[PDB]
């Protein structure tokens, strides 16, 4: 019921700055300190800093002391982390988090959903979505495979759901491939009964947050 | 700078069995005064924020199943999953909150292995280009290898019976937690003009689980 909702994903030029926000609800904002912790793809979590939601004292990691500023708005109940002089290794998911709150009464640990930040001179581009329709060539043993090709986007990621989350069984959303153009492309597939292709509806929900792109593609025979 | 070193970097353990993850800290993180170990164990599924499993090294987080246990003190700590199931396959981090800066271990990837020793051949599916995409001047043909194991598979594209090179891209999923199987997608990307030139398009799949290569084809 305590909620940390962070700002959306971003693409930033090298040497530029990026400000990620973290809206806190469900608790007395003045009571606890919000931490910022980042994770480059596949790497370990790097703790960046913390700020007390009411007081306002900050503590930064010595690695980010030169380029990071944690601030807070006590009315909007929002913490902000600003990273400046963005280098290559800054490309990462930036979480705010109520890291290991161990009070004399309770113990819990809540994170935001994270904010991807890609440091690149390449520009944001939303994907094109194409149906991978079920047919006689995508059937095996009474099952039919169908999907969606999400092509030509930057940066990562796109998320794919099916029937707005009601269809998850047998869904495989593949890791993106990097095309020679520098753009990404992935496919998302699902196996369903071939007998019910006439009665069921399969819609792929594609979301690319950096480009604010939302595509619901109906996938029919 | 408390360095947290985990071992191994990746573990492959089977259902119902014990998973062991060691974490060593470069300095003692047991405060004698209160006899508490300033260590937490975090669980992280892909694309999700990490989830606190243990704090004070061994004090359970509310909700974590009793098959999870924290052991250790001082500089040597262990996370044990006494009976592994698919919802436990994740990446496991130790974390110290003894001193600043807060640091995490390099993480241990807990992977699932087939207790069967058996192999699963891929089910193969082929998708011609959609008419939407052909409107835009390019043609992507998709070959799908579904639910196979082990992960090593070879996909070769043949346009009009000629083996292709330089115009296809491949992506394999991470392991499925339920079946421990993989799926692979290979996309042959042609110009729409280059695609109209030919009729026969096939992907030839070679895998351990197949007695011979399987070809899935269609005529444009």
């Amino acid at each position: 019921q305590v909620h940390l909702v962070q700002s959306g994903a971003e693409v930033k030029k090298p040497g530029a700055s990026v400000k990620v926000s973290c809206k806190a609800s469900g608790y007395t904002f003045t009571s606890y300190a919000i931490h910022w912790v980042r994770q480059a793809p596949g790497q370990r979590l790097e703790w960046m800093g913390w700020i007390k939601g009411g007081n306002g004292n900050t503590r930064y990691s010595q690695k980010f002391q030169d380029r990071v500023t944690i601030t807070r708005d006590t009315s909007a109940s929002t913490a902000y982390m600003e990273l400046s002089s963005l280098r290559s290794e800054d490309t990462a998911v930036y979480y705010c988090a109520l890291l290991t709150v161990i009070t004399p009464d309770d113990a819990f640990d809540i994170w935001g959903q994270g904010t991807m930040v890609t440091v690149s001179s390449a520009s944001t581009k939303g994907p094109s979505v194409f149906p991978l329709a079920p047919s006689s060539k995508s059937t095996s043993g009474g099952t039919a495979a169908l999907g969606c090709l999400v092509k030509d986007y930057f940066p990562e990621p796109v998320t794919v759901s099916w029937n707005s989350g009601a269809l998850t069984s047998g869904v495989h959303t593949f890791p993106a491939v990097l095309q020679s153009s520098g753009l990404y492309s992935l496919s998302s597939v699902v196996t369903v009964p071939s007998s019910s292709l006439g009665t069921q509806t399969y819609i792929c929900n594609v979301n690319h947050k950096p480009s604010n792109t939302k595509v619901d593609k109906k996938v029919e025979p | 700078d408390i360095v947290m070193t985990q071992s191994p970097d990746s573990l492959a353990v089977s259902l119902g069995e014990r998973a062991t993850i060691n974490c060593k800290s470069s300095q003692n993180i047991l405060y004698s005064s209160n006899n508490k170990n300033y260590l937490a164990w975090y669980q992280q599924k892909p694309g999700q924020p990490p989830k606190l499993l243990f704090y004070w090294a061994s004090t359970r987080e509310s909700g974590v199943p009793d098959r999870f246990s924290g052991s250790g003190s001082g500089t040597d700590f262990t996370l044990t999953i006494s009976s592994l199931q698919a919802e436990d396959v994740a990446v496991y981090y130790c974390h110290q909150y003894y001193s600043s800066p807060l640091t995490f271990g390099g993480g241990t990837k807990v992977e699932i292995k087939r207790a069967d020793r058996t192999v699963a051949a891929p089910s193969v599916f082929i998708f011609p280009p959609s008419d939407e995409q052909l409107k835009s001047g390019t043609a992507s043909v998709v070959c799908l290898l579904n639910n196979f194991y082990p992960r090593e598979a070879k996909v070769q594209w043949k346009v009009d019976n000629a083996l292709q090179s330089g115009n296809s891209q491949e992506s394999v999923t991470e392991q499925d937690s339920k079946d421990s199987t993989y799926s692979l997608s290979s996309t042959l990307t042609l110009s729409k003009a280059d695609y109209e030139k030919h009729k026969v398009y096939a992907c030839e799949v070679t895998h351990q689980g197949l007695s011979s290569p399987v070809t899935k084809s269609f005529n444009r």
Partner: peptide
Amino acid sequence: NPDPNANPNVDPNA
């Protein structure tokens, strides 16, 4: 000895 200001959200009491 542990730094209580490493994570202010941690009260060190038993």
